[PDB]
Design an enzyme around this catalytic site. Structure first.
Site, short mmCIF file in Angstrom:
data_model
loop_
_atom_site.label_atom_id
_atom_site.label_comp_id
_atom_site.label_asym_id
_atom_site.label_seq_id
_atom_site.Cartn_x
_atom_site.Cartn_y
_atom_site.Cartn_z
N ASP A 102 0.89 -1.16 0.00
CA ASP A 102 0.00 0.00 0.00
C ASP A 102 0.95 1.23 0.00
O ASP A 102 2.18 1.08 0.28
CB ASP A 102 -0.91 -0.09 1.28
CG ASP A 102 -1.82 1.11 1.51
OD1 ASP A 102 -2.24 1.79 0.53
OD2 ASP A 102 -2.11 1.39 2.71
N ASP A 109 -2.35 -0.89 5.60
CA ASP A 109 -2.59 -0.54 7.04
C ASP A 109 -4.09 -0.65 7.37
O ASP A 109 -4.49 -0.35 8.49
CB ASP A 109 -2.09 0.87 7.40
CG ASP A 109 -2.65 1.92 6.44
OD1 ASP A 109 -2.99 1.51 5.31
OD2 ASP A 109 -2.76 3.12 6.78
N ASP A 136 -0.31 4.91 1.31
CA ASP A 136 -0.61 5.63 2.56
C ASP A 136 -0.52 4.69 3.81
O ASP A 136 -1.24 3.69 3.91
CB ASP A 136 -1.93 6.36 2.46
CG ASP A 136 -2.08 7.42 3.54
OD1 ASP A 136 -1.43 8.47 3.47
OD2 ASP A 136 -2.87 7.21 4.46
N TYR A 186 47.09 12.29 -21.94
CA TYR A 186 48.42 12.35 -21.28
C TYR A 186 49.52 12.79 -22.22
O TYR A 186 50.68 12.96 -21.82
CB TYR A 186 48.81 10.98 -20.84
CG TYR A 186 48.03 10.42 -19.68
CD1 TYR A 186 48.33 10.73 -18.34
CD2 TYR A 186 46.93 9.61 -19.94
CE1 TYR A 186 47.58 10.19 -17.28
CE2 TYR A 186 46.18 9.07 -18.93
CZ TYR A 186 46.52 9.33 -17.63
OH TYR A 186 45.68 8.74 -16.74
N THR A 238 -2.57 1.57 -4.58
CA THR A 238 -3.05 2.67 -3.72
C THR A 238 -4.39 3.29 -4.17
O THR A 238 -4.64 3.44 -5.39
CB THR A 238 -1.96 3.78 -3.70
OG1 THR A 238 -2.46 4.97 -3.11
CG2 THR A 238 -1.44 4.12 -5.16
N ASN A 239 -5.22 3.65 -3.18
CA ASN A 239 -6.35 4.51 -3.43
C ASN A 239 -5.83 5.94 -3.44
O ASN A 239 -5.38 6.43 -2.41
CB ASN A 239 -7.47 4.32 -2.37
CG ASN A 239 -8.27 3.02 -2.59
OD1 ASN A 239 -8.01 2.26 -3.52
ND2 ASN A 239 -9.22 2.76 -1.74
N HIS A 292 41.38 5.18 -5.35
CA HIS A 292 41.40 6.08 -6.45
C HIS A 292 40.02 6.23 -7.13
O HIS A 292 39.72 7.29 -7.62
CB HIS A 292 42.42 5.64 -7.49
CG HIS A 292 42.36 6.48 -8.74
ND1 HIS A 292 42.90 7.76 -8.80
CD2 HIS A 292 41.75 6.27 -9.93
CE1 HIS A 292 42.67 8.27 -10.00
NE2 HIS A 292 41.95 7.39 -10.70
N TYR A 331 53.86 5.77 -14.45
CA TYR A 331 52.89 5.26 -15.42
C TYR A 331 52.54 6.30 -16.56
O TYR A 331 52.32 5.94 -17.74
CB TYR A 331 51.69 4.72 -14.67
CG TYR A 331 50.73 5.78 -14.31
CD1 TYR A 331 49.74 6.16 -15.21
CD2 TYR A 331 50.82 6.44 -13.09
CE1 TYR A 331 48.83 7.17 -14.90
CE2 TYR A 331 49.93 7.46 -12.77
CZ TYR A 331 48.93 7.81 -13.68
OH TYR A 331 48.01 8.80 -13.39
N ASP A 351 39.75 12.74 -11.25
CA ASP A 351 40.94 12.35 -12.04
C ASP A 351 41.20 13.34 -13.17
O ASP A 351 41.23 14.58 -12.95
CB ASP A 351 40.79 10.85 -12.50
CG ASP A 351 42.04 10.34 -13.25
OD1 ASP A 351 42.09 10.39 -14.51
OD2 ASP A 351 43.00 9.97 -12.56
O1 LIG Z 1 49.69 14.79 -19.10
C1 LIG Z 1 49.83 15.65 -18.24
C2 LIG Z 1 49.67 17.15 -18.51
N1 LIG Z 1 50.35 17.89 -17.44
C3 LIG Z 1 50.32 19.37 -17.48
C4 LIG Z 1 48.99 20.08 -17.37
C5 LIG Z 1 48.95 21.39 -16.89
C6 LIG Z 1 47.71 22.02 -16.85
C7 LIG Z 1 46.54 21.40 -17.27
C8 LIG Z 1 46.58 20.10 -17.74
C9 LIG Z 1 47.81 19.45 -17.77
C10 LIG Z 1 50.36 17.36 -16.08
C11 LIG Z 1 50.51 18.14 -14.93
C12 LIG Z 1 50.55 17.58 -13.65
C13 LIG Z 1 50.46 16.21 -13.46
C14 LIG Z 1 50.32 15.41 -14.58
C15 LIG Z 1 50.28 16.00 -15.85
N2 LIG Z 1 50.14 15.18 -16.98
MG LIG Z 2 -3.22 2.94 3.54
#
Ligand SMILES: O=C1CN(Cc2ccccc2)c2ccccc2N1
Ligand SMILES: [Mg+2]
Ligand SMILES: O=C1CN(Cc2ccccc2)c2ccccc2N1
Ligand SMILES: [Mg+2]
Lengths: 546, 546
Positions: B8, B184, B10, B465, B122-123, B523, B382, B334
């Site tokens: 139900d 109820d 209410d 990167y 439900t009503n 992370h 990395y 990130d």
């Molecule tokens: O790939 C990257 C690019 N840069 C410079 C950056 C500067 C300003 C905005 C984006 C990137 C960076 C800076 C710091 C840690 C890792 C990285 N790794």
């Molecule tokens: Mg009820």
């Protein structure tokens, strides 16, 4: 010879200029003439204000430097600043006072439209003030109308430095003498003039436009009223929602604020709202323009009962559920108009307010099958033609360009009557192979509809007319209710099918109904009279939906 | 044996019951006990209230009938109603007082999760009150968790009539003894009991759940805290925006209110926000969860410079322009976190507020190439591995399931170090062929990421990167600014790469920075600690973004 036009922002595309406010503040506050302008310009190329205009620092960081500059100018002129003297205050007020200078924008538009490349070139800042959104909106509205917006603080360069002009010419891919540049500051024109650009010193708007007209040879001043902004399909955000496994709905989405769901009629498209979408967004609404079920990029299953009003409404509810909207404003035209009344009747909790173009609300007659009721009015005969699966599809699909060019016509351009369509054996029996282009639509716009209807044809759309008995029975459950949410009915004078008089008793069932009325307006309301539709919708939204 | 559970609304899924308020009003106002309940029930099956519950009339139409019924009951009991006696008032207050009964919902969820079909029976009424939205929201929140919601006013039938039970059994595709029904009101259980349904008379929530547990044989009471609501991809509204000819961005969109743009990191997806999306929508925000450039259904051009931070930011700006948003709140994790800081620095006017999970803001060093700076910290090695086009792609694409199962791990489940990745010659050199499933993710969720990354692989993602020098040079233009818009930094205790201490000087450049901190959190912040992330984000949004 001239191929590009460049417009300053402050004092040219936006008014009052903010230097305007520095003058007035001085006088209002009885300070030495120009003191505020001296504090503003202090240090010249290395002063606080240039750092700001170049993007080195933000506006909130500059405010206290300008303050210091104001103390320094006042000590050197041997005066005192008043108690409560506030640079932040003056500038907040100055920035929010400036509005788009409409006739300059419209000239810029017209030049773009005759094939000019257009840009805005402005000394401006990175604006991190609490109230920054106001200027962000203004820049969004202006910028969508130009090829480029170049801001000093984004490119690291300032008018009058000669590098921003070279950056300008290079972004325009044009040479010095192919360019006209309008600015209100003579110093800014100088380097353009040096490279051989036409320049216009902008004082009053009209004289500038007269110079611009004389120099470009295009008519800009005293031009007729322009259409509202339309939409380019490929510049829109396109959304897709699966409401059940066979069936997804597509929509175009623009703006933020209360959700407004636009529901087009037969045989149309989200694009039928092209003139409403930017206006309602600009007015502070989140517009959602549907392809209704059966159309465009929404699913089009083949079965007739997938298109009865009950199913169509349940799926509009699901669409809201999945988007996470507890309500929307529903605005409909033609079949979409019928649907939004039924949303008001069956799901008032989901409908913030309801409006219809052309389609009245007339309660079902529980003692007369609707198929019979329809035979009593000669102008509805086209619905009987639509009944037999296949017959209307074959005619309407046979030649798509002809179909839409025959349909989409202003009230004095008509090429078919809705009259004895069955007897004649067709909607187009006595209309041209190649109709002329209505004044309401360009060839390109017709071809948008043609390409849309190539995806699914006319089966899904025609099925909206194929559930008379089923819709009648559903509607009858509602005959005890009234519509008591906020509601607007807009009639179109020269709709000879959905005539204004058909709406005459609506107050019986919707006691607080509001109305608009559009004169000289055929069945295709949104594109017939887009400017008036926009004004009637925006006014009713702001007072009843907000 | 039991295959379905029906709740139900209410008094069962929502509390206080509104009959609750009829009792209290009588007492508060010193009227005869039950007078308000008599007026409410007057005429029984033909009275105003049944017409309402069946959908014959709307709530605004019933209000004045209930009034009349209140006059009639009071004359017959020989008392007077007080001055200011207001049925609309009492009911507004009663409806807004009722909230979701959380432990009943969580039991319903758990039963659904062990494979029960669940419904709400439900009503209830068609609600056209000025204040209708409050209940519309409540129903939206409950309904998304059940297989069916059956409302008396939508189906034309009321509890205790036996036809709504047959309608119930038939919608459930189940037989009388496969069904448990909690209500109820004893009268409502009677006909269910007559067909042979298990029924539970709901007084206090705990005893009902104890009966439900005893009867279903599933643990419902004292269960551990459940995860937040997650998202099913195919139930979301999916949006697509072309920001330039080669390049469209995809996003998932839920909720209404201020726009909140979520920006995931590497190598992730809009889906990485699955636990935040419903919570932020429910909290009154319009969520926009991106596939960032290079991912999922967004475009992934091949060139490295399409992925430098400048270009990525300009295109996020275009995304806003085309959606018609003058601002959004930007929340990143990130790489997305790095990007939102740069949005704050270069486009403050477009950013309502900025927040980052894990990624600190650390101003570029104008005297040290970032490629060099990176060599000074072993945990960033990395990134050097990621530099050479092709090398990381080959490893990461070679086996997608292994890749994400190896990456997406809680802090005590790790199977790789970020340590001497170049030397070892790979991110996975010393990790299993078939990793075990992290507690953070189901097999189905891993396969969502696998299917996403099948569209474009790892080239676009890795290119984020591959613009160190270019990003460094861009960032250096910003070294004079500060971030002075509203900002939140959330650190994760056990992120051994993006460690909390790296964020320690952020107040130098962002003086009004706000913080959260999550303990025991690796992370993958959003799925590691979704409940805490939601609480920290929603609290900061409500105080700083609203
Ligand atoms: O790939 C990257 C690019 N840069 C410079 C950056 C500067 C300003 C905005 C984006 C990137 C960076 C800076 C710091 C840690 C890792 C990285 N790794
Ligand atoms: Mg009820
Ligand atoms: O196709 C139709 C459906 N009905 C009944 C109906 C009743 C309620 C809701 C939708 C449809 C109808 C009524 C009046 C004019 C034309 C039509 N044409
Ligand atoms: Mg100017």
């Amino acid at each position: 010879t001239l191929r590009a036009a460049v417009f300053d922002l402050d004092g040219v595309l936006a008014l009052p200029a903010v230097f305007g406010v520095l003058g007035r503040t001085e006088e209002a506050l009885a300070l030495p003439r120009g003191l505020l302008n001296d504090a503003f310009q202090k240090g010249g190329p290395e002063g606080a204000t240039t750092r700001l205009m170049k993007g080195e620092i933000t506006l909130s960081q500059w405010i206290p430097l300008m303050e210091e500059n104001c103390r320094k100018c006042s000590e050197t002129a041997k005066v005192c600043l008043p108690k409560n003297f506030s640079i932040k205050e003056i500038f907040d007020k100055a920035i929010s006072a400036r509005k788009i200078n409409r006739p300059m924008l419209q000239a810029a538009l017209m030049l773009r439209k005759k094939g000019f490349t257009t840009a805005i070139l402005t000394n401006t800042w990175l604006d991190d003030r609490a109230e920054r959104d106001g200027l962000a909106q203004l820049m969004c509205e202006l910028k969508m109308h130009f090829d480029f917006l170049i801001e000093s603080c984004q490119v690291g360069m300032v008018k009058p430095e000669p590098q921003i002009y070279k950056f300008l010419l290079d972004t325009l891919k044009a040479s010095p003498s192919e360019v006209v540049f309008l600015d209100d500051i003579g110093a800014n024109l100088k380097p353009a003039r040096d490279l051989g650009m036409v320049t216009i010193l902008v004082q009053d708007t009209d004289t500038a436009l007269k110079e611009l007209e004389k120099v470009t040879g295009i008519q800009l001043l005293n031009t007729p009223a322009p259409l509202p902004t339309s939409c380019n399909p490929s510049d829109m955000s396109h959304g897709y929602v699966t409401v059940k496994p066979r069936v997804r709905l597509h929509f175009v989405e623009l703006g933020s604020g209360p959700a407004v769901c636009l529901c087009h009629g037969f045989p149309e498209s989200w694009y039928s709202w092209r003139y409403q979408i930017p206006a309602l967004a600009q007015a502070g609404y989140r517009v959602l323009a549907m392809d209704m079920k059966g159309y465009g990029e929404s699913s089009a299953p083949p079965e007739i009962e997938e298109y009865c009003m009950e199913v169509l409404c349940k799926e509009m509810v699901t669409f809201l559920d999945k988007l996470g909207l507890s309500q929307a404003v529903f605005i409909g035209h033609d079949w979409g108009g019928m649907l939004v009344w039924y949303m008001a009747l069956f799901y008032p909790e989901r409908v913030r307010a309801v409006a219809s173009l052309n389609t009245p609300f007339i309660p079902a007659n529980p003692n007369m099958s609707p198929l019979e009721s329809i035979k009593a009015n000669p102008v509805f005969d086209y619905q009987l033609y639509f009944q037999e699966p296949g017959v209307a599809e074959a005619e309407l699909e046979q030649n798509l360009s002809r179909t839409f060019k025959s349909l989409f016509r202003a009230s004095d351009e008509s090429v078919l009557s809705m009259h004895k369509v069955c007897e004649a054996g067709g909607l187009f029996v006595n209309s041209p192979e190649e109709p002329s282009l209505s004044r309401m639509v360009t060839e390109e716009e017709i071809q948008f509809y043609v390409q849309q209807f190539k995806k699914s044809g006319f089966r899904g759309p025609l099925n909206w007319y194929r559930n008379m008995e089923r819709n009648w029975k559903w509607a009858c459950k509602s005959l005890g209710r009234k519509i008591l949410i906020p509601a607007l009915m807009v009639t179109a004078e020269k709709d000879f099918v959905l005539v204004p008089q058909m709406s005459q008793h609506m107050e019986d069932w919707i006691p607080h109904l509001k109305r608009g009325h559009i004169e000289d307006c055929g069945h295709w309301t949104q594109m017939d009279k887009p400017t008036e539709v926009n004004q009637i919708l925006i006014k009713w939204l702001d007072s009843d939906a907000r």
